Design a protein around this ligand. Structure first.
Ligand code: HEM
Ligand code: HEM
Ligand SMILES: [O]
Ligand SMILES: [O]
Lengths: 153, 153
């Protein structure tokens, strides 16, 4: 996993990408296609482009570069933002409070119980399934941070 | 994993939690402490509160319930946001484009090289280490979605 400082380094450099996303995207795809030609064969749209000149001249390759780095920038930002809320909670619950994963399972079950009790008409079996899975992913995320911090949960 | 509709169900029910967060937080901790009395022993401020009545009268237990459901709500929303961008990418790249994880490693190499080439002043050894780890976590997240979809590589 990344520290807070490491995430800030990632977001700082992504700021530079966004100032010329089209140029960054083009250079990334040309570097990829030239180093690993089998990757170009996956693009039915582009595999006819032989020369670096033809790749640089392609409107669509340049537009696709922008699509790729736009999507990746959004994933990295949303990852960083989830980390910024998960990390402090995992830190206190591992090091200060020392809360076992089983206790996190108990409060997860309590939350599902209370939502079923307060919203019986709305919180049906499907919605309950959704919340059960989301709280399991939450517990797994905490457990992975516990491990990194060397707390046996 | 959760489907798109399942994530929306999680967000919808959290809106109902936030409409009476005091009541929800109280009832969650009461359900936890009454169902699993060993969990009360973790709370120096609360562990003397044995009955549901004593717990319901505690202004501090009610405030702590709100702190818990506020923290959890923020983490679920940030998780949903990351999933909303990761899921469609894993879906197309598994089912339509059929992109092996190794090819994601190749484009990750190209990204790091282009960032180092264009922005050496903002892409030192540490920052490069940070981006290498972030892109590996991205690949791992896609690989986990590939597995759910039963696509190997
Ligand atoms: C950082 C890594 C990557 C990102 C963020 C990314 C993102 C995207 C996005 C947003 C699209 C358009 C929407 C979609 O179909 O899902 C796309 C299309 C596509 N990607 Fe990727 N991609 C990545 C890596 C790769 C790699 C390594 C390959 C192949 C070697 C690949 C092959 C394709 C293909 C063939 C399409 C369809 C393009 C078209 O015909 O217009 N992707 N990608
Ligand atoms: C959804 C699960 C949980 C969430 C979101 C959560 C969140 C929080 C937050 C935000 C705090 C205050 C800030 C902090 O110290 O990190 C806190 C404190 C605490 N939590 Fe949790 N918590 C959870 C589960 C648990 C469980 C299951 C236990 C024990 C069985 C526990 C025990 C504590 C304790 C002892 C404190 C310190 C209380 C004080 O002295 O004021 N937590 N929790
Ligand atoms: O792509
Ligand atoms: O908590």
């Amino acid at each position: 996993g990344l520290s807070d400082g490491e995430w800030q380094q990632v977001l700082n450099v992504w700021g530079k990408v966004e100032a010329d996303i089209a140029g960054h995207g083009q250079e990334v795809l040309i570097r990829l296609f030239t180093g690993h030609p089998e990757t170009l064969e996956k693009f039915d749209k582009f595999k006819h482009l032989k020369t670096e000149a033809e790749m640089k001249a392609s409107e669509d390759l340049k537009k696709h570069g922008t699509v790729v780095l736009t999507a990746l920038g959004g994933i990295l930002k949303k990852h960083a933002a989830h980390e910024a809320e998960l990390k402090p909670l995992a830190q206190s619950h591992a090091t200060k409070h020392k809360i076992p994963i089983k206790y996190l399972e108990f409060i997860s079950d309590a939350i599902i119980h209370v939502l079923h009790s307060k919203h019986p008409g709305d919180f049906g079996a499907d919605a309950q399934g959704a919340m059960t899975k989301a709280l399991e992913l939450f517990r797994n995320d905490i457990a992975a941070k516990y491990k990194e911090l060397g707390f046996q949960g």
